[PDB]
Design a protein around this nucleic acid. Structure first.
Ligand SMILES: [Mg+2]
Ligand SMILES: [Mg+2]
Ligand SMILES: [Mg+2]
Ligand SMILES: [Mg+2]
Ligand SMILES: [Mg+2]
Ligand SMILES: [Mg+2]
Ligand SMILES: [Mg+2]
Ligand SMILES: [Mg+2]
Ligand SMILES: [Mg+2]
Ligand SMILES: [Mg+2]
Ligand SMILES: [Mg+2]
Ligand SMILES: [Mg+2]
Ligand SMILES: [Mg+2]
Ligand SMILES: [Mg+2]
Ligand SMILES: [Mg+2]
Ligand SMILES: [Mg+2]
Ligand SMILES: [Mg+2]
Ligand SMILES: [Mg+2]
Ligand SMILES: [Mg+2]
Lengths: 75, 159, 168, 175, 187
RNA sequence: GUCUACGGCCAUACCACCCUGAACGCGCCCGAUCUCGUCUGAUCUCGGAAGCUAAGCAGGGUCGGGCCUGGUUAGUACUUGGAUGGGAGACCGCCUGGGAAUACCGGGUGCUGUAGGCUU
RNA sequence: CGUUCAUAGCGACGUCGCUUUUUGAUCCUUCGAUGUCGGCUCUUCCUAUCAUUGUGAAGCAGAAUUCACCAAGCGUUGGAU
RNA sequence: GAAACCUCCCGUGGAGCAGAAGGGCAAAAGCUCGCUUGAUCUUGAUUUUCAGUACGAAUACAGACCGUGAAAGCGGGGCCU
RNA sequence: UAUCCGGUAAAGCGAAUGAUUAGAGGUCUUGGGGCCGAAACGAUCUCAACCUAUUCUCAAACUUUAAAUGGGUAAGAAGCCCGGCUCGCUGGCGUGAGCCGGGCGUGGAAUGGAGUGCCUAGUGGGCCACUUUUGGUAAGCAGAACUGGCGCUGCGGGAUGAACCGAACGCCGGGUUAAGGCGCCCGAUGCCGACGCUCAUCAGACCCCAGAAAAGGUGUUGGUUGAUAUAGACAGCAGGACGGUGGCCAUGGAAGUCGGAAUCCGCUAAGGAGUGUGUAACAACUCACCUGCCGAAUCAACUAGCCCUGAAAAUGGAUGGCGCU
RNA sequence: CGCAAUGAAGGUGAAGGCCGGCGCGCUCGCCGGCCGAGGUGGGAUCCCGAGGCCUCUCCAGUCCGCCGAGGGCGCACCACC
């Protein structure tokens, strides 16, 4: 009593009932499996972003004032 | 039932082409992949360290990691019913920049040129592409000489 | 010689049924909205579109409709897609309500958009629900073989208009 | 190809121009077919064989029906063939006697089906040339070349066998 | 013969609430009407939520309702919750709020009213604002239920953190072959 | 025009034999005290500068081989899709689109980056 | 080969078939059972004709004969192991 | 002496690289020397079989402590299967 | 529309690997056997392997080439373009990454509402067809690929029928079709249907399909190629068929004649050093070139249509039946 | 049962920020004040709203809408840090 041994006959059909969906792409994928030495350093960089805040805020206010002067000169 | 061995059936795939054996010429090594570079994988026989598996040869995907002398590269591999985006660590020698994306960037650059200009002019320009339309109305001058008649030729047995 | 323009637009009739049909064909046939047998659609031609018709050749009869064909199809069997309900174009208040944002405000405008293949063709053509035509009066020649070789399938260019009259 | 009664068509076409070949040469044919649709197809088949030239690579310039210029003359037509047997492919020279080329080629297609069970798609017509009383090689044609032709219609079998399906009179076939 | 799959032709969303209780069903009669006759989509959202299950309308804690109204700008408003308002013993100072709820627990009721808070029923909200104008529509955390900790990529499937259904935790209930490296392997 | 040093692409750059090379280079070349290394100062290392383009090297040449690139081969071989087409089968023809490979015959025979010479 | 002569009768090396009275393949049917060899007895069919009727062939003088055709009407026995 | 050792020329690998075969390999991945223990200690990630579980086998890193080389580097076993 | 991947079909072997035919050329090597040589790369052949151009024919586990069908990516707001901050990484300065803050909108065709999570049954014997395909002489055999069937499924056609073709079913009226048909059975040709072919003492008569081949036939019908003939042929009857010559090899006899190398001249009008018969061997007979008569076409070799031979099974029998020219 | 885990166990056990000061601001240690469950992207929904759009006249002009370009708070939920 020998069987059928293997096949792939009805399988494509079976797969395509429910699509063959592409793998759901997000923005902001994880940093799992990224070269450790990198990840330390981007972690440290992220740690000290709040250091150098007061400088950054002022720079944007100076930029915003320069934009407001430019738009007044245009109008 | 076939053997599950890693390199089964790559007699031809991983085999340097005709009269291109020997030293892996150096541009190959010394060109830079960043994150998110579109990259097509193509295994190579000379370099056996960091070889991709025979399933990812031909396949294109994006770079996610870059180590000292290899590049982590997300590629989509189908499995019966489900496409699995998965991340593989190929050594540079088995990898090129895929040009597929550059022709796109060329077009967007050309669009940004054609958007900046034609704004002060006022005349809006076709930025979208369009498929090859039917080939328009036109005259054909049979200049002096008439058409050439083509009789089909009588059969004969050559061999 | 005056080689006139290659045609812009073609009517495409599904001339065989819905059993035992390959998956690539079947998909294209439901990208032309040709689900039932003897449904038809207008179709603007171009390298992309024409090749999609090439992949469904022995499943369709098609070609280049007359002016009269576009009228007869639209007036006798012109049905809007209006909130996804196939609704018969009994008045222009229907066409306008839907296509009036394109300058198309009446049956006549619609016919001109379909026949000249205007800017707004995609939107006027999709608005039209696919044409449920009857069986071909006087019969066909042969369903299964190409026009060129005696049958009905494939591109018959001018002669799609005869078929239209015997089905519409 | 199939049939009905054919029409001579003139079909001229060209491999469409390029940068390298700016004004390409026109090629004309004599393509017998039931309609222009299959005419043009038939044009492309013959050209493909002869010239590196496909329907994609070319444009048909002028397809046009061609009318017999002497319909109400009776003519003799020589026609050269190229058929396919069950076995090998062959050549012939048939001769027909007709009022037209179209009629004479149509006549051929029926004969070939009869005499050689050859179907349309197997047959290639190369040349069809009208011909004198002489230069007629077939005696089936030659017997009608005669001034005072004279024959009866001897055993004139009836049709209208079902106007009177039943009747008293046994029929008549002498006239 | 036509080719469509009739497979997902029937949408499975609820229409009415599955409950038979009469007071909720009156709210439904009211909000059906408002839903259909107002342009407010607030009414539609509220209406939709009246049909949902207990599970599906989780309790909104007082502290969660505080902090969501603490947010900048939604001040002098009314918070709405188709679920219930519960207490937080781990919050102390309760601002004076405006609230709608199908239920508010007896503690949560006291605390709010002691603050000078107003509590509203949903019939009252409609008369107060039939188009949902000036409302904060909140919800309880849907994925609070301990249930969800068993859902997902199964336990013993690498990089899953999915609670297994186990009779009792302890030294010798699971945590052998397939969690330790020492014992076979680990995921 | 051209070279040297480090090159990229790796024969349009290879091989064979033949001819010609101003100047600067590059070489061959002359030595072994020292450095270094050999059975051997041949190679390797080192100190030179009397000779010479003989050779390497460059540039050219050959109805040259080779390679590169077109034609032809051929709409041929093959081939996607089609038919209640043929044929006893083997196989073949048509429709619908796609379409090669030798032999054979042409043409070509390194391009170029950085840094520094020479022809002032 | 047949003295001689490819073909009266034969027929190598090759080749194309039919047949299911051989044996294999195969396992479709039957395992809530289709009684498993031979002989006896009896009927009927087939022809791929041994005899018998009518005929063509011969390397048919006669006699004896093999080769072929129409053809299955009628036959095809008694014993020893 | 067809074969010992030496020497000149040609030699795209037609040899060799433990083993089957396939791939790969020439101022090497072959042979011959010199020095060696990266076949050591330790986290995770990934690939391959895959259910996308294990085992084995492998890939890229990262942290130690070394080796070797003028150095750039290479090396956590065996060119790869 | 761009862009990568490929080593199957084909093709190739005067390109590698392996196979393999033939002659040219070559003392390459050298031989083993010869013949003429004492012996001699001397002369002459020869066969061995090797080589110089060529040449015949091949490959699932060969290949320089190399398709069709095929598999990735990409075709924008998660995108571009500016400004500035963070780093223990990297570093002559710079990288590279991560952060803030602004500035810009449809970016190929066609279609369609999407996403997402929980519980979950049955199933885990399959089979059939196109095409591809391995084992086997083959199988209604066994085994894969690809799609579509049947299984789960009725209906029109295929007489009959899982699976062929057409088409997929709520319950009904009118219309129209498909695939199939239209002598009668049986709805429709009871058309003045069109043109041919074919007579069978075994006719033939429609996918799957239920049946025949090699090889034959002046049966009849078409082709193809060559002839021929007024220097009046072609058949049909009538007249000669020789000599140089027992030609030479072969004697066992071949003066034309078991066989074979030859194989020309004369007379010529013309006869082969002979088609056969037959002879021990001759003889004798028989088989061109030309006339006489008769009076226009004649004849050969292929080829493909129908028909026929090839063609034998057991209850009486099946183009479905009746029948049909 | 639930409101706390994690470790084999001895056991341990879910806060952070900011500001000012004092220790050398040493991306470490100690003393005063303020906020108090972080942030990115998307998010039904609310909120603000330039501006229309008319009114039987030319303007003034509060009331009512309808839409609303643009801009905000952002539930749940998801992905990331
Ligand atoms: Mg099984
Ligand atoms: Mg079919
Ligand atoms: Mg259903
Ligand atoms: Mg020296
Ligand atoms: Mg020199
Ligand atoms: Mg020289
Ligand atoms: Mg050359
Ligand atoms: Mg004999
Ligand atoms: Mg049996
Ligand atoms: Mg019984
Ligand atoms: Mg018999
Ligand atoms: Mg080694
Ligand atoms: Mg290390
Ligand atoms: Mg292969
Ligand atoms: Mg092949
Ligand atoms: Mg079972
Ligand atoms: Mg079986
Ligand atoms: Mg079953
Ligand atoms: Mg079907």
């Amino acid at each position: 009593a020998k069987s059928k041994n293997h096949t792939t006959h009805n399988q494509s059909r079976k797969w395509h009932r429910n699509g063959i969906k592409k793998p759901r792409s997000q923005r902001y994928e994880s940093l799992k499996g990224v070269d450790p030495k990198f990840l330390r350093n981007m972690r440290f960089a992220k740690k000290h972003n709040k250091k150098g805040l007061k400088k950054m805020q002022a720079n944007n206010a100076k930029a915003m004032a320069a934009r407001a002067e430019a738009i007044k000169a245009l109008v | 039932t076939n053997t599950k061995g890693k390199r089964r059936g790559t007699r031809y795939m991983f085999s340097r082409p005709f009269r291109k054996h020997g030293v892996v010429p150096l541009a190959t090594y010394m060109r830079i992949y960043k994150k998110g570079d579109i990259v097509d994988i193509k295994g190579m026989g000379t370099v056996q360290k960091g070889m991709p598996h025979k399933c990812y040869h031909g396949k294109t995907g994006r770079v996610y990691n870059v180590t000292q002398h290899a590049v982590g590269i997300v590629v989509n591999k189908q499995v019966k019913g489900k496409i699995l985006a998965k991340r593989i660590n190929v050594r540079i020698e088995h990898i090129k920049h895929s040009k597929s994306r550059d022709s796109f960037l060329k077009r967007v650059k050309e669009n940004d040129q054609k958007k900046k200009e034609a704004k002060e002019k006022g005349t809006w320009v076709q930025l979208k592409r369009q498929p090859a339309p039917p080939r328009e109305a036109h005259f054909v001058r049979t200049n002096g000489k008439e058409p050439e008649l083509l009789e089909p030729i009588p059969y004969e047995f050559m061999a | 010689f005056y080689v006139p323009a290659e045609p812009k637009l073609a009517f495409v009739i599904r001339i065989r049924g819905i059993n035992g049909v390959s998956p690539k064909v079947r998909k294209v046939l439901q990208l032309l909205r040709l689900r039932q047998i003897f449904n038809g659609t207008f179709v603007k031609l171009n390298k992309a579109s024409i090749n999609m018709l090439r992949i469904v050749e022995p499943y369709i009869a098609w070609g280049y409709p007359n002016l009269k064909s576009v009228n007869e199809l639209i007036y006798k069997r012109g049905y809007g897609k209006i909130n996804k309900k196939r609704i018969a174009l009994t008045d222009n208040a229907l066409i306008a309500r839907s296509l009036g944002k394109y300058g198309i405000i009446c049956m006549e405008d619609l016919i001109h958009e379909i026949y000249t293949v205007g800017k707004r063709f995609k939107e006027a053509n999709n608005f039209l629900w696919p044409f449920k035509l009857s069986s071909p009066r006087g019969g066909m020649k042969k369903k299964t073989t190409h026009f060129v070789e005696g049958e009905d399938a494939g591109n018959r260019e001018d002669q799609i208009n005869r078929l239209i009259r015997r089905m519409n | 190809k199939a049939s009905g009664t054919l029409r001579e068509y003139k079909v001229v076409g060209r491999c469409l121009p390029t940068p390298k070949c700016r004004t390409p040469p026109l090629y004309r044919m004599r393509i017998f077919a039931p309609n222009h649709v299959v005419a043009k197809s038939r044009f492309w088949y013959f050209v493909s064989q002869l010239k590196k030239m496909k329907k994609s690579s070319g444009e048909i310039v002028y397809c046009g029906q061609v009318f017999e210029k002497s319909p109400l003359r009776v003519k003799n037509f020589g026609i050269w063939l190229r058929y396919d047997s069950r076995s090998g492919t062959h050549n012939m020279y048939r001769e027909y006697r007709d009022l037209t080329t179209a009629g004479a080629v149509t006549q051929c297609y029926r004969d070939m089906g009869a005499r050689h069970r050859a179907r349309a798609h197997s047959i290639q017509i190369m040349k069809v040339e009208e011909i004198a009383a002489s230069k007629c090689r077939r005696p089936a044609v030659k017997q009608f070349h005669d001034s005072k032709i004279k024959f009866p219609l001897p055993h004139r079998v009836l049709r209208r066998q079902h106007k009177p399906r039943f009747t008293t009179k046994r029929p008549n076939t002498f006239f | 013969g036509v080719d469509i799959r009739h497979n997902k032709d029937r949408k499975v969303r609820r229409k009415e609430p599955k409950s038979q209780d009469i007071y909720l069903r009156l709210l439904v009669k009211l909000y059906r009407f408002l839903a259909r006759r107002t342009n407010s989509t607030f009414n539609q959202v509220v209406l939709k939520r009246l049909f949902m299950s207990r599970t599906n309308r989780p309790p909104l804690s007082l502290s969660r309702m505080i902090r969501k109204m603490k947010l900048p700008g939604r001040e002098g408003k009314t918070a709405v919750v188709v679920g219930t308002i519960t207490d937080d013993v781990r919050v102390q100072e309760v601002p004076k709020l405006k609230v709608c709820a199908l239920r508010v627990s007896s503690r949560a009721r006291s605390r709010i009213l002691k603050a000078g808070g107003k509590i509203l029923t949903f019939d009252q909200l409609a008369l107060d604002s039939p188009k949902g104008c000036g409302t904060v529509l909140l919800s309880g955390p849907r994925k609070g239920r301990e249930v969800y900790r068993h859902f997902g990529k199964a336990p013993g499937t690498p990089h899953s953190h999915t609670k297994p259904y186990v009779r009792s935790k302890g030294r010798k209930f699971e945590r052998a072959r397939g969690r330790r490296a020492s014992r076979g392997y680990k995921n």
